[PDB]
Each structure stands twice: as C-alpha cells, then as structure tokens.
Amino acid sequence: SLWVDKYRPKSLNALSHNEELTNFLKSLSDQPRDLPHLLLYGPNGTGKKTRCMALLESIFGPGVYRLKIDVRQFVTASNRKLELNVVSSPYHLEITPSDMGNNDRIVIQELLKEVAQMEQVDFQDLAHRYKCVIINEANSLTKDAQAALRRTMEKYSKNIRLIMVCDSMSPIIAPIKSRCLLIRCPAPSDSEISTILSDVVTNERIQLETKDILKRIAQASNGNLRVSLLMLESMALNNELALKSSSPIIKPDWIIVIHKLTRKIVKERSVNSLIECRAVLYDLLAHCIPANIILKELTFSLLDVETLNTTNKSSIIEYSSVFDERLSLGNKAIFHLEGFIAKVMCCLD
Amino acid sequence: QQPWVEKYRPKNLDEVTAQDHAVTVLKKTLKSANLPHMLFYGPPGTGKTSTILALTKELYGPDLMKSRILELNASDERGISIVREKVKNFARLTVSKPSKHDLENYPCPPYKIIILDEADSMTADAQSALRRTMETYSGVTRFCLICNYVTRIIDPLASRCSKFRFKALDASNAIDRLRFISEQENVKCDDGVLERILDISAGDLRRGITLLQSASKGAQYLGDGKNITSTQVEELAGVVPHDILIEIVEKVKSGDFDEIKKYVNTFMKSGWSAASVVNQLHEYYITNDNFDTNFKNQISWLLFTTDSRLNNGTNEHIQLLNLLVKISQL
Amino acid sequence: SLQLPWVEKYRPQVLSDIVGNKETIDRLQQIAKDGNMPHMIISGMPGIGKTTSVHCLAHELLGRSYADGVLELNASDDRGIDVVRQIKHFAQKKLHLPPGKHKIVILDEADSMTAGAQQALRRTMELYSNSTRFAFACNQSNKIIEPLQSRCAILRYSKLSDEDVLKRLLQIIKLEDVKYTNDGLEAIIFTAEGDMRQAINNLQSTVAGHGLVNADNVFKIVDSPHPLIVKKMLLASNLEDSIQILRTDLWKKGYSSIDIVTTSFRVTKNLAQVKESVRLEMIKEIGLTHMRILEGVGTYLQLASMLAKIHKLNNK
Amino acid sequence: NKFSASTVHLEHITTALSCLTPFGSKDDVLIFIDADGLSFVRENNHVIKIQLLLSRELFMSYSYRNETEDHMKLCVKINHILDSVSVMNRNSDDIVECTLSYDGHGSPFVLIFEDSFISERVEYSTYLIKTNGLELDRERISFEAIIKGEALHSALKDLKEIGCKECYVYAKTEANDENVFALISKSQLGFSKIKLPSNRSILEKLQVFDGDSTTVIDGFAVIGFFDFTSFDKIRKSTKIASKVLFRMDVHGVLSVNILSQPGIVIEVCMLEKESAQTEIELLMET
Amino acid sequence: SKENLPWVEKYRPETLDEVYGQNEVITTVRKFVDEGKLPHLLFYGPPGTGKTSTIVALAREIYGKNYSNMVLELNASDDRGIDVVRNQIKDFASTRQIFSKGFKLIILDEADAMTNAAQNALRRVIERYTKNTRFCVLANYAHKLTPALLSRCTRFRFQPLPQEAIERRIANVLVHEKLKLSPNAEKALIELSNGDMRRVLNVLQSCKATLDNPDEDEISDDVIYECCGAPRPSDLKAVLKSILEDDWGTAHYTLNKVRSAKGLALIDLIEGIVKILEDYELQNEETRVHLLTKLADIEYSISKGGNDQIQGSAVIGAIKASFENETV
C-alpha cells in the first residue's frame, strides 16, 4: 500500500502532530454518551479524517477500520436512477454526497433519514447505541442538502451523530454550524512533518543523505502531509531507495502547467495569448480539477513573480477576489477563469 | 444522556427566555381559541422551534398531538404537488374528538396546527398554493411558518401570517438561562465567563450551550477542580488570539505586499476561520480612537464587502489577503 | 341579466364594419366575393380584428353552408396530432359548394399548437388543398413552423390608429345613445393604446359608473398606461423627479415592484434618443434589480437604488 | 354509537360503490345518515350529481340513536374506501357481516368485516363538507319516459362504441300511440340515431307536457342537448337497472331514476348544455 | 363559531358596504350589478386590499342562496392546468344555469400563478360562453398574465387602503372587541400597515393579547412598538443624529445601545432611516445616489444574513461618506 495508508495512525494515542487537539479529542471521547455533532475544519491533508477515525476507534473500540463498500441507489425528482458508494463500518457510516452532484438532496433525505429513524436498540441497548455518520467534503453540499440536515440531526440525534470533515466553513450555512461543535485542525509545522518523514524513512530504506531534504519536502508541501509522503515515496522510488540533496522535489503536473500559464501571461499579453491561455485552461478543466483551485493557484503563482510591482499584485488579488465571488455564484467556470486572465494581462501592460 | 441543547430544550412556554413579546401572546391564546396564523422569523438558535413545540404540547398534550399536529420541514419533500394534496387534505380534515382526560386537563382548542418549519426553502409556487388553503380552512386549521430569512417568504403569505420576530439572544437577556444550565450541570467558571460565551455566540444560545458543554467536558477531563477561564472558551470557539491579531495589523501597517502575502499564507495554515478574524479586525478598527473618520468610513465598507463575499462561499485565502492588502493601502 | 357586454353585443358581423387595416379589409372583401380564398395566416396584436375578420370572411364566403363548411378549432379545444389526424375527415368530406367556394378550417390561436400537429397539418394541407382551405389566426407568426408559412399567404394586421378607434366608438355610442365629450373620448383612445376591445370595455365601464364620458370620469376608473409612466420615470433629468414618479405614480398606486422592473426592461428595449452604451448599462442595472426582486427583496429601496444607478450612468 | 348498521348481503353495498365510481374515482363522497336509510351523494364539476340510497330494510340492525339532529352528514374520500374494500373482497366468498358505524362529528367512519374468525376494522377519516341545487323542478316537467334497463344500457354501450362526443334526446308523442324516444349522437360516424321502440315492454310510458307536468299535448318535441361525458355516468347504474325513469323540465335538468331489484334506488341529475336543432327535427322527420 | 377565528378572517366583509377604501371600483361594480350586465372583470392590486372580499360579496349580491351553484371558484390551491381549463371550466360554462340569477360566474383567484397554456386556452372560453358566464380574474402581479387575457378583461385597480378607511375599520374592530386605542397608537398602526388591512388586524389582535386587562386597558404606541418589535420614532431620530453629528465611536455606541434597549433589528432601523433620508433637502444629488446604492446593498446582504455587527458599521460608514459630499 501507499506510505500515506501503510503508516496511517490507527488510534488516538498514535497522533503526533497536534497535542492540544489530541487532548481535546480524548476529552470528547472520555464520555461518549453525550457527544455532540462535530465539524472538523482545517487545511487539506492535516489528518482530519485520521483524527475522526481515531476518535471513532476510541468511542466504539477497535472495529471501525474494517470498511466494506455498499452500493446504494436512488432516483431523482424525475425518473433518473442514481448510484452512490456507501463505505460502512459495523459502528459508523461514511458517505460522500458531493460525488452524486446537485442531487445530494435525495441522498440526504432518504439514506440519512432512514438511518436516523432506526433506533438501533438491540434488546434494551456510546457503543453500538447511537450511530456516527461521516460526511466527507461537507463544503460541496449545494445549500439545500444542508437544509435537510437541520432537522435530521436535531430530532433523531438520540440514535445518530454526525461528524463531518470539511476544508473551510465558508460554504456551510449558519444553521448547520450552529448545531455542531467546531473543531479546528491546524496544519503541522515543518518540524513535525520532518519528524514524521524521519520515522517513515527509519521504518523504510530510502537511505537519506541529509535530513535537510525532508525539510525541503515539508516546505514544498505547504503543510500537506499526504502530499509530503507522496513526494517522499515519489523521490524514494524515482531516485531509488536513495534521497540525495540533488534529488528533484517533484510537484504535480497541473501545478507546473499553471506555472507555465503564469509565465506565458507575464511574457505575452495579447489576444492570441489569451486564446492559448483559454486552451490550457480547458485542458486543465478536462482533468476534473475544480475551477476555484485553478484560480487560487494561478493567483498565487502570479503573486510570486518578482518582476511585478506592488500595484500590479494588488490589482491581481482584487481581480482574483472578484472573479472568485463570480465563480461561486455561477454555472460555467470558463467565463470567469477567462475574465480573470483577461483583466490580469490588461493590467500588467 | 443527551447533548445539553437537546436536554435543556424548553418544555413549556415559561422556559423560553428573552422572547416575551411573542410568548405572552401565545400564552394568552391558551385561554382563548383565536390563535392566528404565525410567522416565526429570527436569527438561528433563538428559540422558534422550541417555542412552537412548547405551545403545541401545552395546547394539546402528548395524546392529542399525534392527531392534531402536522409538521413538515426541509427534510421531506414539499413541492407543489405535496402542498396541493397532503397539506390541503390535512387542512380539510375534521377536528378529532378529544378524550375526557384531554378535555379535563388540556384546553384542546377546536383546530389543528400545521407547522411548516424551514419555510424559506420552499419554492414560490408552493407558497402561492398555500394562500387559499390557509384562508378557506382558517376556522378548522392553523398554520405556523418558521424561517430565518423573512424575505424568502412571499408577500401574500407574509400578509396572512402574524409576524413574530425572535430577538437575538445576547449576554443581557440570556445570561440567566446559561447560568441556570451551569448551576444545574455543576460547571465552575470565573467571573466574566458565561458572558464571553454569549459574546462569542452572537445571538445564538444553541452555540453558547454547546460551547459550555465542550468546556465542561474538557475541564472534567483535565481533573484539577479549577474553574473554566475565558481563554479556554475563546480557544474552543475558534477566536484568534490577540497576539496573532496584533501581528496581522502590524504587518498591515507596514504596507509591504509580499510580507502580508507570506503572513497570510502562514496564517491560513493554522486553520483560523476567515469570518472570525474579519469580525475581530472589525472590532479593533472601529472601536479604536487612533484612526480618523475617513479611515473608518472606508474600512467599514471594505469589511462589509469582504463579509458579503465570504458569506457566498468563496476562497478565504483570496478574500483575507485582498482585505488586508486593501487595509494596507488606505 | 339579459344584456350582453358591448364587446360581444357590437362584434362586427360583416367585413364592412371592421375598422382599420383598410387595405387588408378591402382585400378580404374581394376574396369574399371573387372566391378562391388562399391559405392565409393572420397575425397582429390583440384587439385588432384577426378573428372578427376570419369569421366574417367565412360567413360571407360559405354563407348557407357555414355549418358544414367552417371547422373551427381553437386553444380551448384539444388540437393534438390525434385531432389533426377531425381535420382529416372534414377535409375528405365532399360538399356541393357554389363555384369558387371552398371549405374553411379556422384554426384560431394556431401559435399554441404542438409541432406534431403542425407537421401533420402540412400533410392535410398538401393532400386536400383543392377542396378545403386553412385560415390560421395568431398573435406571433413565428410560432407557426416555416413549412406551414410557406404554403400560406401572410397578412399582417397593424395596430389600429386613433381614427379607426374613434370611428367605431362613435358608432357604438350612437347605437347606445350615451353622453360624451371630446376630451373623454380622447382619453378613452389614449388609454386603449390601439386596442378596440379595451376601448369598448373602458367606455362601457365609464358609462356604467357615471354615464358622462369626460376626462375626469374616464381617468378616475381607468388608469393611464403604466408603460408610459415607466418611460416618463426613466427619462427624467434629475433623480428627484424620477424617484418622485416611482413613488407617487407607481408605488402608492399599487403596482408591484416586479411589474415595474419588467415594464422598465421593455421600455429600455424600445427607448429612443439614448446611446447604445447607455441603453445596455440600463439593461444591466434593470437585470440586477430584477435578480434582487426575484430573490425576495421586493422593496422600494431597491427600485430607488436602480433609478439612482440609471441617473448616475446617464449624467456621465 | 350514534349510528350502526349490519348486513351480510355485501354484494348490495359493493354494487352501490361500483355505481359511485363513474362520478370520478379519487374525490370526496358525501354520506347522509337519517332514520330512513343510508345515502351516498356525489357531485362532479357542479354539472351532474348522483344520489344512491340504501334503505333501512337492507340492514337487520339500524339503530340511529342520534337525537340532537335528524340527519347526519359526513365527507370521506372514495379512493380510500375503494382501495380498502378492493383487498377486503379477496376472500368475499366467506360469510362476511359488514358493520357500518359513526359516532358523530369528529369521529371516523368505521367499517368492520367479521368472518367469525377475523374482525377487520377500518376507520375512515372524515373531512370538512364543502349538493341539492341540482334538482329538477317537480312542477315543470316537459317529458316523462319510463324505459327498460337493458335497452338503455345497450343504447349507452352503443353510443360509447360510436364515440359520441355529444348527445341528443327526443321526446315526442303524436296524436296516436306514436311515442317517439331517440338518443341522437354527434360522433365520428356523423349524425347517428338510436330510436327506442314504441312498444310497451321497452318504453312503458312516454308523456310530453307544456312545462307544467299536467297538460299533455301531441306533435311537439322536447330537445335535450347533453354532454356524453356526463351522460355516460349512468351506464354503470343502468347495468343493474330493471326500469329507468327519465324526467326533464324546461330549465334543462335531466333526472334519471334507476330502481334495482329492495335492491338500491339511484337518482342522477344532469344539466343541459347551452346549444343543430333543425338538423335534429329534419333527421327524425326523415 | 366566529369568535374563535383570527381577526383577519373574523372581520372579512360580507357585503359591499363593508369594503372600505376602494370607492370607485365598488360604485362601478354596484352599478354594473344593478344594470344587470357584468363584464369580465380583472382585479389588480397589492395583497390584502380587498379583492377576494369584493368579488365574493358581489357574487353574494348577484346570486344569494345559490352562490354555491352559480359561482365556480378556482385558486392556486387547486390544479389549473390545460386539462382543468379544457374540462372543468368548459363544462361549467357550457351547461345551463337553471335560469337562476341569469349568467353563471367563474372566479379565478391568484391567476398570476396559472401557466401560460391555461391562460391561452381560457381566451376562447371567456369570449365564447360570455352569453352564459362571466369570468373574474384576481391577481397581484400583472406581468404573469398573457396580454390577450388582459385585453378581454376589464381592469379595476385596487389601490392601497387610504388612512381614512383604515381608521373607520379600526373603529369597527375596536367597538366589536371593546378596545381603546390612543390617537398616537392609531397613527403608528396605520403607518406600520403600509396600506394593508390584514397587518392592521393582526397587530391589533397582538395588542389585545399584550394588554393585561383587554378591557379597561388601552393600547398605547409603546404597546404597539413592543408587540410588533419596531423602533420608536425617537429611536430612529436619535440614531440618525448620532451618526450625523457625533464621532465614529459615539455613533457606534449609541446605535448598539439603541438596538440592545429593546432588541431592535437592523433592517427596521435601516428602513426608518431611509424614510427620513428620503425626506431630506439634499443639494449635491450624489448624496442621494450613494445613499440609495449603498443602503440597498446593505439591505440585500442583510436579507442573506452575515455579521450583524459589520453591517451596522457599514451603514454608519455609508451615511457619513454620502453626507461628506453634501459639504464637498
């Protein structure tokens, strides 16, 4: 398996990148009977899902990591048969309503309502009494599945509990946030990522030459542990079980494509350059990369150019904010992704 | 047992704090039988659902409720078809005969109540198909609409429904309830606490009771028998520490775009919410006396625009960086 | 309980009593006498005589066989492809008509028909063109498919002028011996806006309410067309007067904000003496206000803000 | 229990329910409870109304202990009753004793099915009441015809098979025993006519009056223009009719009276269209 | 019976005498009824102005005991698709009225919610059976009705209720409930209604419930403002004066104190300030534009929620900004 999964912490005592948060999780799990609904928010890849699974182990004992997949099908308002993968555990449940699209409403109103209606009592029943359902990517719920959750998890909370993992809580409506306990998961420092990578290379044979390259991995990952371990394995496979200080820090292909787009924008500012930028943006979108991420990375690559003055960067960030707001309240992403670029190269000239 | 929010839910109308302008009217309804159609609107976690459930319990009782109450929320389909058949049929139903126990213990008004919670999520056609359903069967059926944004309720429906605004629960009107919960849950706190909880929870008692529950859980876990301090509740809420805010504003005072860019980049890794930091910046910049009128006039609009953009579900790194850059160039 | 409304009581029964479209009406009378009436599509706006002319044409043409000759179908009747497959037996029917006369199939409101029905109507119009003729009457000619318009002679009815409205009003008045004055009839025509039916209805209402058709009595029960008040509001010089109109003549009169926004959109589309950039900016502002109104904020402050933005983009 | 009725001849109430189906199949039904018997009333679009009546003699027990009011009115949906009795008639060959019950306003309509081993009990929810204005004037009858059930049922079936978008009725009795009664239809075939015979076994009595039900005259005919959508609502009731009585007044109301063999009495009131008259006369003089 | 009904439904007019405010239309329809000819009517106006009441009372003075067999009332609570128009309305219109009260009446309440296909099909039912039936159309939004339908219907506009009509009806309600209302309370009620009878009746019912002794106890303006939760005029004037003259900190403190004194919301304060601003004698004409634009944006944002403390500061900043161009 991958080094992100093979070395995944499988308990609350195995966490080693945030201790205040681990103490808080232990405090929550000491008395599991009055556990409220929890909303874990923080940067991507900090270990929010790992912390949730550790908490579920701590509350329901070992038994929560034995996942198996259930195929569950619905039908939209019209006769549109739909499928959703449901990975389930003897003590908890996990679904990703965002994977089905704008029709997560039927999923929330049928699957979750059915599980919340069942009492789970087994001959006069914390452990296999209430149920825990994990909503992965709670940000992508389309402002309506969050409305169907306001009463589902407030009326049937005696036999079900909700713990949702979301990076950021801007797209989550106020009523949903009000009913839940907010748990913040800060990103680990570079020293902690270096320590984790050192442990991995100690249990592995990557044959490090200097422990200042693990620091380079940590700095290049921008606080993302999954990405850090992915680069570690990448270099420790392309460069053999050997990591020299000359080894190349591997970055995702879409990132370097966005950097090339940035350099093209800075160099060439003309209508034909705009059309080629559109072609590259279409190629990026053809890989199912979300448009907000494309805009964010493009903006933060444009702000990294050393040949731009402060006024150009301020204009770039203002246009980025305006077009991010437009993208949020929009249907087609290409219009806004093109408008941002057009304004950028109309300002740099 | 159960979360303190689902354990201290008001059971009668006398447990509903801070809303007397509406609870008094609903209590006067008990002796009479002229309950009008009600439109409950207000900020989240203000007690609308609790108030209506308490009123229903006091009017009917556990036995007659199952026959004289219909509750429809956003968790179930409420399209035009459902509105035109199911709600209409329930409104057309005859009032069930109350039992002798019910008549001798409860007022048992000669009508039923249809509770449409989260009515703001209903479409305009569904709300239009309600007007004559309420008007024609007003004498045998009553309607209660619960919503957070009154603008999402169409004007014709808002005209026929009596409007009851539920006030925001601040530290001046909900301190007694939180104190009661604390003394009944044996929660020890310093002076100033249980007021900072209500200040952080802007007009929301549900969150001001969940925060207190989490603080008590942690305090019981640590096991030193010491009170809960303001720092602990603040940290648990998600409030940015004052030192980080001071560093942010010093970087803003500097003006350098790349310094601000890197501080924001390292700040977004901490996971702090953009809304909370924006609110703290608002408090700092408006209540200070070191800034001129023009500075405050411009920054109020800047913070307003940033908050409006954040409420729409946008990237917080782009919005926070833009707000700080703008504040650095005023 | 025995009187019929003046709209139906005075509906013309002969082609000579149909005011307006002088040339078109003369052509229709010539077709009535000569015969050999072609397939026709009669378009135009409401209240001009598109159905009072097709029915009169069918009457004066078929005459005594107006019962076995005129198959009238309209939106109130089912007109699916199945019906078009009632329209086939009627066409196949043989009736001994005078020379030059043909059966008429009056499909009133042909713009609301389904496209399958039209694709079958083409078959019927192609196989049975020598015995029966089709007279489509609609409000927008584009709703009839091009293959059907190809086989038909398009006759477009223009808006009725003030003189053809005044002449018919004078006829109806002389028949109803009501009292009037010149200003009252001018106001009735002004509020009619090229509609004969609306003019008749307004005259009937004024006579019933008061009896004397003067300006005051007409205007106290019939309101001046609000599209014109919207146009007056949008062309104001300073914002004071524009907001003043918006309030007094549109808000306190009971008009809904959404109605004002839609009327403003149409007025801007048809506005004159305004630059294209200004027109498109006003269209954008009106669209934003429409969005705000549809989302729930149906307040007078939104309309005031829209007028302020329009003035701001006008003065610069 | 303010009302209680027991019977074992469930086929009678089954035919009563199947005679109420033509008047829409998912809507409200009015049930009038009085000392004389049990009556179901249905109305459609304010243009046609049916009124079946189950007499006290059809039940061994019929209490009606209600004293405050002489008659009791309740409104229950018909789809619920149909869907229930449909699955209850699965084992109808068993000796079932139906028991109707009603405890007053606010109480459900009970329908107990006991087989001496299983006692199924159903409580139908009663709805608010929105049906007499649709009644012919008894002093204004223009024609009164008594027709046999089988002949009328056959004529209605034929008119259904011909389509019969619109229908016409004729009632002329000439100087001699020339009782003419016909059912003309405006159908795809064109102008079709079904003429009832003048013999006394099919047409027992035809009498045409001058709108007063007292003065009989010959040589004049009363014409009724009816929509066959409403006219087909009596076909399912004529299927079990021994004799059918037709009455119409000058206000344009046709009152079909159906008697079954004691059995069940069915009263249907039908409204006349606005309105071909000369075509009718010319076709029947021909 | 009629004593356990809401005041909005208990005080529904039964005859055209009791419909106030709308005088011209009532006079015209009374003359139409007496003359015996009734055209196809269309009633237009704001909600709660008395359209349904007017048409129902007219159809009770036109029919009587047969108001249930001569009038077919269809509204938004009923399906009104193409099939409904083609079958139910067509069969009601074609049939005869048993000669009762001449023509039959069809009332289409809330016709603005009807689909365009149904309205287009109704055109040839309105003008074919006009000899037997008369159609009435009730709508609040005229843009949702086809122009052809508007052409064949006589348009009567129901204006917002004037002050005099509200005063008369409030007096009727008071006498029928044995209540006392001060002149200032009546002013406040008639002003908060915005030409709505239903709002008046609901607020009066809440006022009666608020009073300890519904009889012997008067409804002052304070009671009205407490029950309806609206700012007092003095509160709005004080907030505005603090914003205009005092500094930023004092203005912020005064706004917060005013809102916390009685739990006042921000949207009602915004509206109250907006009216006073509308009255002002501005001399720059960009003050007005900035005020309207900024306050409309703030109101829309409030309509979608957010930080209620950021929005108050936004309001203060918008006012100060706009009223700095006045001195320019």
Ligand SMILES: Nc1ncnc2c1ncn2[C@@H]1O[C@H](COP(=O)(O)OP(=O)(O)OP(O)(O)=S)[C@@H](O)[C@H]1O
């Ligand atoms: N006035 C009050 N007195 C006591 N508890 C209250 C009050 N208002 C709210 N609460 C508490 O707030 C929690 C939730 O209140 P609810 O009224 O059910 O939520 P809400 O008002 O419907 O907000 P929504 O559903 O998001 S619109 C419960 O634990 C209540 O005990």
Ligand SMILES: Nc1ncnc2c1ncn2[C@@H]1O[C@H](COP(=O)(O)OP(=O)(O)OP(O)(O)=S)[C@@H](O)[C@H]1O
């Ligand atoms: N040219 C005309 N001269 C006199 N009266 C007319 C004329 N056109 C229409 N009318 C009157 O309008 C009414 C009949 O309306 P129509 O002519 O059928 O309207 P229309 O042109 O068919 O518009 P649509 O398509 O039905 S909305 C009667 O009251 C007529 O007297």
Ligand SMILES: Nc1ncnc2c1ncn2[C@@H]1O[C@H](COP(=O)(O)OP(=O)(O)OP(O)(O)=S)[C@@H](O)[C@H]1O
């Ligand atoms: N002119 C009036 N005089 C007295 N009471 C009135 C008047 N207008 C309205 N009301 C009251 O307000 C209630 C609602 O008015 P309605 O006439 O039923 O509805 P409406 O005015 O047609 O508004 P919509 O468009 O139907 S929401 C009535 O039941 C009356 O109690």
Ligand SMILES: Nc1ncnc2c1ncn2[C@@H]1O[C@H](COP(=O)(O)OP(=O)(O)O)[C@@H](O)[C@H]1O
């Ligand atoms: N405390 C930890 N110790 C070691 N590895 C960790 C720790 N926390 C997270 N990780 C690593 O990070 C990877 C991804 O974490 P993940 O659960 O995806 O975070 P998020 O839920 O925020 O995306 C896991 O494969 C895990 O190995």
Ligand SMILES: [Mg+2]
């Ligand atoms: Mg609620």
Ligand SMILES: [Mg+2]
């Ligand atoms: Mg026409």
Ligand SMILES: [Mg+2]
């Ligand atoms: Mg109404």
